[PDB]
Design a protein around this ligand. Sequence first.
Ligand SMILES: *C(=O)[C@@H](NC(=O)[C@H](NN1CCN(CC)C(=O)C1=O)c1ccccc1)[C@@H]1N[C@@H](C(=O)O)C(C)(C)S1
Ligand SMILES: *C(=O)[C@@H](NC(=O)[C@H](NN1CCN(CC)C(=O)C1=O)c1ccccc1)[C@@H]1N[C@@H](C(=O)O)C(C)(C)S1
Lengths: 433, 438
Amino acid sequence: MINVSDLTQKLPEGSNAGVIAKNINQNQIIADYNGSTFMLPASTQKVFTAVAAKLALGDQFQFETALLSNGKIQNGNLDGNLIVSFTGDPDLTRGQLYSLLAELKKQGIKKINGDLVLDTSVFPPAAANIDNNCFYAELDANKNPGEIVKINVPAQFPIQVFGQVYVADSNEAPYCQLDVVVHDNNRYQVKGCLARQYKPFGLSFAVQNTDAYAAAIIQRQLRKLGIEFNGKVLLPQKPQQGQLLAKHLSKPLPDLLKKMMKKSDNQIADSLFRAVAFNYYKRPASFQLGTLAVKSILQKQGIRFGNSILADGSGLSRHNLVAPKTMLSVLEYIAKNEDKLHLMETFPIAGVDGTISGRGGLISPPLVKNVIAKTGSLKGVYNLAGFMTNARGEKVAFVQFINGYSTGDLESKTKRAPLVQFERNLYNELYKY
Amino acid sequence: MINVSDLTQKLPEGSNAGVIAKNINQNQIIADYNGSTFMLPASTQKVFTAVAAKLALGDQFQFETALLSNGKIQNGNLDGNLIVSFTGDPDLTRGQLYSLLAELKKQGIKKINGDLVLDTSVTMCFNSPPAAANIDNNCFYAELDANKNPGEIVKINVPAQFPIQVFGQVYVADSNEAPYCQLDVVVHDNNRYQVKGCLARQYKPFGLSFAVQNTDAYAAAIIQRQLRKLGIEFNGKVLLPQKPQQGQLLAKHLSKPLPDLLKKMMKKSDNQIADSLFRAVAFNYYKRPASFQLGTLAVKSILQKQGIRFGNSILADGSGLSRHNLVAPKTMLSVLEYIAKNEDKLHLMETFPIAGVDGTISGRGGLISPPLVKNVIAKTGSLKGVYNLAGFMTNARGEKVAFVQFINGYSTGDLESKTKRAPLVQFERNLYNELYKY
Ligand SMILES: *C(=O)[C@@H](NC(=O)[C@H](NN1CCN(CC)C(=O)C1=O)c1ccccc1)[C@@H]1N[C@@H](C(=O)O)C(C)(C)S1
Ligand SMILES: *C(=O)[C@@H](NC(=O)[C@H](NN1CCN(CC)C(=O)C1=O)c1ccccc1)[C@@H]1N[C@@H](C(=O)O)C(C)(C)S1
């Protein structure tokens, strides 16, 4: 075997690596180092969600956002509620929702009579995603040290940002972060400080109450369209029986999976995860339901998980526990079954695209243009799961998990130079073996 | 050295161990297995906090909770504001807040003219905001009656002494629907809790333990209930200014002093005490409102001047709850030695739990038999997947052994099953026997 222990010698002190590689042609493990330890997979977890979506959902699957009602359309009139059905489209734009609201005119509706009803069916992303569910505020931090920073909320966001962030007397642009606590109805409170800065800038934020964010946005929207709504907003817990008035469809599975994999989009992963459960189980979907359904389905294919912990679709969670060799095994299922699944194309490509176009240790020959890999990142965690071709035109699957990687403070993640030297030498050896 | 690697074959497949042990008497490391891998320490991290506290706080430290006023006591009235000062006391009870306020009566006060001003400076109940204002651990009990037929709505019972509101519409699910239920708790503003989902029919009373989210509101409402029951009149505003508040000291509650606080934190692993002390340490050492990041810098720095070297450890908290903690066993070991070497001045040895006698190891299966029982002392750490010990024992030749044991990655089941400890019990029984006999 390759000598991995030699390589980890220059990863920072105290880190741990889990590395394993199999030459698919020769049917032979050619590297195997802590191959069996459970570690944090981070975004390499999406490999599993990919394969599970393929199997349980299929290529024709699409996310559906839908307008409905039981009311009789009268003259301009809608004599019932407007139920708006959200099913976790991770892709939905403000743009597209508006367009869906438009089908209400073309059908003659001037005035909606009853209430606005919002329907959900999953139990960072939710039923109602709009524009990646996030926003920004405008900070002006060109003030005196010790003096309040001016903050604005673009008018297009139904958000409050209160609290008060003073300027950092550089006597302390060390002892300083920015505390953000959320309150009922997307009211965000801010505290602490920043360092003096000349230009104006943007702080991005996740939307916490997405239900409410989406009912607010919809109401701006019926107004801009001249549809008179005067009712309440109901957020029932049950599916809402109504009559299909109109619908909006996401791009389909292969594009969704292409974006997830190449780019490492968490929301696609974690909505797909849950969509997988909703379909396998035919009922509202938790993350737990998602674990059950994704293990069960990969298990019908002969993937053995042991006591692996698969806590989400994207691998963000610090409770995920899986061993290289189980990741390794899912890859080989991918290669073997490529003819049918077409998952090989989704992996980013070294020095060419997705999350590893510029990846330091991969952008020379013979790895540039050769090594494809789903990457994974957290603070202290740098992973690669994927494939390459060696000196004989042979195929090689691998899995590199690195955890507890640490060289610096809360003030910043320090140098990646050991990572880059590690991966370089690592993949060079796999090539050459 | 001990072949720890063979003992690990007894742990569940997947798990990782870090083990290191020094025989202090000889100055010999006698086990060194991943001695240098950073791992999750869990509650053993209160070992760092305990030493930093002895050194910066000192044995005469007490937390203060205090009444102050700018007013004057005249003719039956405090003419001015009631200031109530909270500084993180994690043991404060409703009852002691009560007597503290009753000192107001005793002092002539049957009505206050000004407002109530609170002053600061820093789902379930194990984590719990160790906040400036703690009352009854910031923790309350609801009771769910789900002894009812499939279909029915679960009765929620809040005891009346809690100023909170639990609400919602949980229903009882038939045993078909039953395994698919989620019960959850959505936290709304000003201590209002919404519980949704269902559970299976239940045949005892189901309890919820909630952590209070808005501790400042919580305390203010309580203080008002207590002024009313005391027959002190008050009609003013409840103000929460964020800066320290001036006033003449009218009265002051003091907690038990540090040795008690430490004995309880070490023996029983109290998270609140650890996270409270972690911050008092910052306040006192830097003299400034204190946060977790300040706690981190101060503990690191206090220990550093004593010779402890942290390298790139991450100490995210005083209690070790956080899963961002990273520290290498060998680093834990040097604190242990430092603790055994300066025992004459620190007296931390007696705070350690005692195999089969007390604390969180009085019933620890891998330690219940001789020669470990009454010999091994050790701080435990536990989280889902983590099972650690940090302590000392006397070996067969009667010399002192200091050890550290980190186990992470421990999984024997579905993510919400009762973990099986039999592998753990085995591995510990064997490891400690090796350290004893070595
Ligand atoms: C998968 O590994 C993804 N990584 C991240 O999302 C990671 N995100 N985090 C880490 C910390 N937390 C805790 C609350 C987050 O909010 C959070 O979302 C992250 C994000 C930015 C920079 C570093 C790490 C995705 N995959 C990664 C990859 O390497 O493929 C990214 C960087 C593309 S994100
Ligand atoms: C230190 O290790 C302490 N462990 C825990 O509190 C621990 N886990 N918790 C409580 C806090 N949260 C907040 C989200 C958790 O999710 C969580 O894991 C715990 C609590 C109860 C049961 C098991 C683990 C204390 N030390 C432990 C020890 O072994 O000495 C305990 C179990 C005595 S608690």
